[PDB]
Amino acid sequence: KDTYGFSILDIVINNPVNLTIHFGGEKGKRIRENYSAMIFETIVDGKLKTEKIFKEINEHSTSYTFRSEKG
Amino acid sequence: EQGIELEHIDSKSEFAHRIMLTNILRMMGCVKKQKSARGIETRPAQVI
Amino acid sequence: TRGANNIIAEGIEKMGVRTFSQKEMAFNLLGLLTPEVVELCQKS
């Protein structure tokens, strides 16, 4: 909840098909920056290429929705 | 409300006051209660 | 805002005061729903 603003307990209990995280207020901005911080780094030709997880998150993004087929 | 001065404040004025202040405050309180019950802290509603 | 109170709106504007129409007032109110004003409201 503090880092990414979702409840793993809630996800396990209910198994929602979709889950929307909202970035309003100071806590929302902190969660948004946490979402933007994480990056998958790869080594190609001895170069540290960065691939940003959550393409659809930026300074102007107000929410992010996790998409799933069944749950 | 037209032509309702201090001496004329009556049922209609009290009802209008309810609509325009008290039930507005109740409506924001209801939205607050729903958001808190659903554990929403990061999606505030903008009361204009 | 202009929808009794309209016949004098021209007279109130002769002194620099500004009177709005319903469309202009709605535009002003919707300007408060922009993302930046929303973020400002969330700040304070």
C-alpha–C-alpha distance, residues A49 and C36, integer Å: 33
Experimentally, the structure was elucidated by: cryo-EM
* DSSP code of residue A60: T
- β-pairing, A47-52 with A39-44? antiparallel
User: C29 — contact with chain B (CB < 8 Å)?
Assistant: yes
Helix H or strand E encompassing A26: helix A25-37
C-alpha–C-alpha distance, residues A22 and A4, integer Å: 10
Contact B2, C4 (CB under 8 A): no
CA angle A29, B31, B1 (to 5 degrees): 120
The alpha-carbon gap from A15 to the nearest alpha carbon of chain B, in Å, equals 16
Longest dimension (CA), chain C: 41
CATH number for A60: 6.10.60.10
Domain that holds residue A38: 17-70
Q: What is the resolution of this structure in A?
A: 2.7
What torsion do the CA atoms of B27, B29, B34, B36 make, to the nearest 10 degrees? 160
Q: Residue C14, Cβ neighbours under 10 Å: how many?
A: 7
C-alpha–C-alpha distance, residues B8 and A38, integer Å: 65
User: C42 — contact with chain A (CB < 8 Å)?
Assistant: yes
